[PDB]
Symmetry: D2
Subunit: 125 residues, 4 copies
């Protein structure tokens, strides 16, 4: 990623923010991937809620990552958006974690959602 | 839109929700349009904050509209996402409203953001 | 929608373009809805390809709608993006149509994708 | 990113594809950042076309990255979407490159768009 390099060259120019943007995009891709993998499993009927939560988590994480990319002093929705993203990731983590013993893709995704949750919460500080 | 027709045919199947989805997509398109119009004005330097808020409002409104399209009994991020969208629209409305005397596009956008704010807040009930 | 009203107030200011933007957002919402409905069906394992195509069609249609909202004389990706959106909608229509006898949501979605395909192709002219 | 780890655990499971997904998300974030930086420059009126192209490139790159994340044998829009993304990045590169002597953020962005263009074109093979 080029998050850190772009922040330093912004004419209005933060480690917690860089980590948050990086994680949001990582987590968006991972959740989109996890949903698709779940859709290809024999046992897809057991993964409906997981697929749905991953789709919502991918959407929210892209939005949050985009918003945060534009947050390098003026009033912003950033802190509200990051709280919502943290809650989304917490929910998605919980469901992916439940399937992690059965599907390796869900273990990887649950780990990324946990990290993203932490990153987004830390950037609200 | 086909929001109402699709909700009624969902196997797990709400006027406030239909109005919220419709408005989110209307508002996303309107804000994207408003940002582009502002970017073409002689006086673009006065509209920087407006353009930035419109970009964030378009992103959040698409996300909210998508999430809400998937919310037709299971646990959801919906109510959190709709609160964030309502706050986003309130912020964007305020700035577009400030320019409404000068730019007709901003008057139209401020009106749509006001309506979307109301719709999203009403769907959290 | 406010597509037509916003185009007329753009400082750089087209019926085919308005219809294309409107349809892209309608189709994005419809496909997102169709995927979610398919995910809730008893027979979800038969709908894997449909769900996947709907997810891609929602993503492409939002992108196309956004791009087209910013296309009201300068060089643009618009015509390329609209060709891609037309191909996406054609593919998604074909698969939703295949399930239309079994699931009413897929009949509605197939009809919207057909219309969106036509609209996007007509706006490339 | 977790692109490579997720592809290997997909139940239907490609170096060119991994590089393409990674680059699309990098480029989406970079272009969103570049647009915001341009919007904060004294000389924003000279950067209108650059801002507009960056917004379109961010939208297309997210879409392409998402689609490609779901492309790990069945029929797909992938190759069409990647051609469109390659054309988008070529256009955005050209305009960012034109401003690269004046704005360091545009130099970084032009380099990322060039790389993403190459990656997306290589994944169509
Ligand atoms: Cu995230
Ligand atoms: Cu994620
Ligand atoms: Cu999954
Ligand atoms: Cu997730
Ligand atoms: Cu997420
Ligand atoms: Cu999150
Ligand atoms: Cu986040
Ligand atoms: Cu997540
Ligand atoms: Cu999850
Ligand atoms: Cu998974
Ligand atoms: Cu998962
Ligand atoms: Cu995850
Ligand atoms: Cu997950
Ligand atoms: Cu996440
Ligand atoms: Cu996060
Ligand atoms: Cu809205
Ligand atoms: Cu709006
Ligand atoms: Cu505007
Ligand atoms: Cu707005
Ligand atoms: Cu909005
Ligand atoms: Cu909103
Ligand atoms: Cu909303
Ligand atoms: Cu708004
Ligand atoms: Cu606004
Ligand atoms: Cu405006
Ligand atoms: Cu506005
Ligand atoms: Cu508005
Ligand atoms: Cu506005
Ligand atoms: Cu709004
Ligand atoms: Cu709303
Ligand atoms: Cu469409
Ligand atoms: Cu559609
Ligand atoms: Cu469906
Ligand atoms: Cu579709
Ligand atoms: Cu579509
Ligand atoms: Cu389309
Ligand atoms: Cu289209
Ligand atoms: Cu479609
Ligand atoms: Cu379809
Ligand atoms: Cu359907
Ligand atoms: Cu369908
Ligand atoms: Cu459809
Ligand atoms: Cu469909
Ligand atoms: Cu469509
Ligand atoms: Cu269309
Ligand atoms: Cu790209
Ligand atoms: Cu880019
Ligand atoms: Cu820039
Ligand atoms: Cu760009
Ligand atoms: Cu791009
Ligand atoms: Cu690209
Ligand atoms: Cu690309
Ligand atoms: Cu680019
Ligand atoms: Cu560019
Ligand atoms: Cu830049
Ligand atoms: Cu740039
Ligand atoms: Cu770039
Ligand atoms: Cu750029
Ligand atoms: Cu790019
Ligand atoms: Cu690329
Ligand atoms: Na900002
Ligand atoms: Na749902
Ligand atoms: Na334009
Ligand atoms: Na696929």
């Amino acid at each position: 990623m080029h998050v850190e390099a772009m922040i330093s060259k912004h004419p209005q120019a933060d480690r917690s923010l860089v980590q948050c943007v990086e994680m949001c995009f990582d987590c968006a891709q991972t959740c989109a991937a996890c949903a698709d993998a779940c859709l290809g499993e024999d046992k897809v009927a057991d993964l409906r809620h997981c697929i749905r939560l991953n789709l919502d988590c991918a959407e929210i994480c892209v939005a949050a990552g985009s918003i945060a990319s534009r947050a390098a002093t003026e009033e912003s929705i950033l802190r509200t958006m990051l709280q919502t993203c943290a809650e989304m990731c917490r929910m998605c983590e919980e469901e992916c974690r439940r399937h992690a013993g059965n599907h390796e893709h869900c273990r990887i995704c649950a780990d990324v959602c946990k990290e993203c949750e932490t990153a987004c919460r830390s950037a609200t500080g």
